[PDB]
């Protein structure tokens, strides 16, 4: 199927308390593979998956250089942002960045992304055509004018359609066994009396990958949303995810309800009944 590569970075100014903190992580699909922390003593792009360890010291030098340089650019960007908005140096501000590409199954380009948020809000983004920019506000108009004049979009598109998709293909091989794997949910159902009049029916999805999943409840083969709780899909800590869905059910009714479970790893959907 499709695959994605992403880099996520976060700069946080620390007013009165030294230089900004810079953390960047890289992901292929739902798996992390590298990290860099400005405060760490090693000062290098470190490996965060087994399949990236088979890379030469050229790789680790190039990537260290590039990430270390981006930290300085964003460090300066925070100073620029303050002045643009005339904001007190006393307050801490955050700058986040998303970068990456999507490929189809055949390995070809599908999509590219480059975008920035200032204090949790959209700041600037490369549009899908990868030729133009969306500024969020007057402050980002200034940035966007710079970037047009300098032709950042042309550089980014070339990287996005080439070096990124190539990089992605390459990664999907080196960790073929971690990355092209599909782990189906191990599913089950529990039951918790609340009153002698009501009960909680809880439907579980466990040790699955990738993270996308759908859990539904049904009363007599017909959908139900009333009195249902659906927690957020969560990391297990081993490269797999968990999720659960519950319904409050009046006593004696338990068997009118079914749980439905859809995941790429299931050859066929699952139906669970108490």
């Amino acid at each position: 199927g499709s695959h994605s590569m992403r880099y996520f970075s976060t700069s946080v100014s620390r007013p009165g308390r030294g230089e900004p903190r810079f953390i960047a992580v890289g992901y292929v699909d739902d798996t992390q593979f590298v990290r860099f922390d400005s405060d760490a003593a090693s000062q290098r792009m470190e490996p965060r998956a087994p399949w990236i360890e088979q890379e030469g010291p050229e790789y680790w030098d190039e990537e260290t250089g590039k990430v270390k340089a981006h930290s300085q650019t964003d460090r300066e960007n925070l100073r620029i942002a303050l002045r643009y908005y005339n904001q007190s140096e006393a307050g801490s501000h955050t700058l986040q960045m998303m970068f990456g590409c999507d490929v189809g199954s055949d390995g070809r380009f599908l999509r590219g992304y480059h975008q920035y948020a200032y204090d949790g809000k959209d700041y600037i983004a490369l549009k899908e055509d990868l030729r133009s920019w969306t500024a969020a506000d007057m402050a980002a108009q200034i940035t966007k004018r710079k970037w047009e004049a300098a032709h950042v979009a042309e550089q980014q598109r070339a990287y996005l359609e080439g070096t990124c998709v190539d990089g992605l293909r390459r990664y999907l091989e080196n960790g073929k066994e971690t990355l092209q794997r599909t782990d189906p949910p191990k599913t089950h159902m529990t039951h918790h009396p609340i009153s002698d009049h009501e009960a909680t029916l809880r439907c579980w999805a466990l040790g699955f990958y990738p993270a996308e999943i759908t859990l539904t409840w049904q009363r007599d083969g017909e959908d139900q949303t009333q009195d249902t709780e659906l927690v957020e899909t969560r990391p297990a800590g081993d490269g797999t995810f968990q999720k659960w869905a519950a319904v409050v059910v009046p006593s004696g009714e338990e068997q009118r309800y079914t749980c439905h479970v859809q995941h790429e790893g299931l050859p066929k959907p699952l139906t669970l009944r108490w």
């Binding site: 590039k66 960007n77 970037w147 300098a150 950042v152 550089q155 990287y159 070096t163 990089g167």
Partner: peptide, 10 residues
Amino acid sequence: RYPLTLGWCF
């Protein structure tokens, strides 16, 4: 493949 960020100045 970390992006080339040289031109990303605000």
